[PDB]
């Protein structure tokens, strides 16, 4: 086409979606990870994760307001990944890299799994 | 912080949100523009438009599944702007620039209003 493009549009959209999350505006699901609860937007979860994409395209699960993750999933690892979904920023540290990689493999977040594998290989 | 960043994350998120829109997945509102109907995600509309942000943060309007725009709003201008919201791409042409600018001013999409003003000034 003959379209023009606004370079910062996608980043600005994501920034506003994170502002809505921080204010709990139009969140439509709670993700339960052991004792911890995380509120989010189903559409953002699907856009970032192969696991959530599969869950919320399911004709029955699409209507659930609560999703319980596998008890092996670490709440901190999930928190770091949820923050990444809404910001593009990953808080990857020596002390959390194993929990982050395991959570990203479960959530099917291929690019995060790739950077965790590379950072582990370097050490 | 000591975060790393995935450059393409915001663009990839927006691409997936547009895929959900094209398949009518988790759309939660219909925007009525004269005789025309447009399905969308309230969160994406809010993230892109000052008008939708104000509408869906309203304690009563946040629950509406149908929003009717002012009858002066042109359906094609709205369609071009809705496409821009989900893609960062604006189909700005000589034949639509006046309707696009008027719709962007009504929707409170400041960056689109700015490029329309600049393109009109050049001609």
């Amino acid at each position: 086409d003959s379209c023009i493009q606004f370079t910062r549009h996608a980043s600005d959209v994501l920034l506003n979606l994170n502002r809505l999350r921080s204010r709990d505006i139009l969140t439509d699901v709670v993700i339960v990870v052991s004792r911890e609860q995380f509120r989010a937007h189903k559409t953002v979860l699907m856009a970032c994760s192969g696991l959530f994409y599969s869950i919320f395209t399911d004709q029955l699960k699409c209507n659930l307001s609560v999703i319980n993750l596998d008890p092996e999933i670490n709440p901190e690892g999930f928190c770091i990944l949820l923050d990444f979904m809404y910001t593009s920023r990953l808080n990857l540290r020596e002390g959390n890299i194993m929990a982050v990689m395991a959570t990203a493999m479960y959530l099917q977040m291929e690019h995060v799994v790739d950077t965790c594998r590379k950072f582990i290989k370097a050490s | 912080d000591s975060c790393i960043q995935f450059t393409r994350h915001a663009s990839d998120v927006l691409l997936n949100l547009n895929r959900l829109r094209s398949r009518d997945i988790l759309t939660d509102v219909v925007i009525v523009v004269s005789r025309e109907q447009f399905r969308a995600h309230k969160t994406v509309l809010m993230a892109c438009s000052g008008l939708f942000y104000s509408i869906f943060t309203d304690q009563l309007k946040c629950n509406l599944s149908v929003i009717n725009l002012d009858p002066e709003i042109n359906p094609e201008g709205f369609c071009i702007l809705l496409d821009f919201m989900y893609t960062s791409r604006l189909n700005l042409r000589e034949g639509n620039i006046m309707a696009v600018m008027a719709t962007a001013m009504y929707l409170q999409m400041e960056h689109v209003v700015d490029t329309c003003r600049k393109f009109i000034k050049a001609s």
Partner: peptide, 4 residues
Amino acid sequence: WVIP
């Protein structure tokens, strides 16, 4: 704004 750019030409994509």
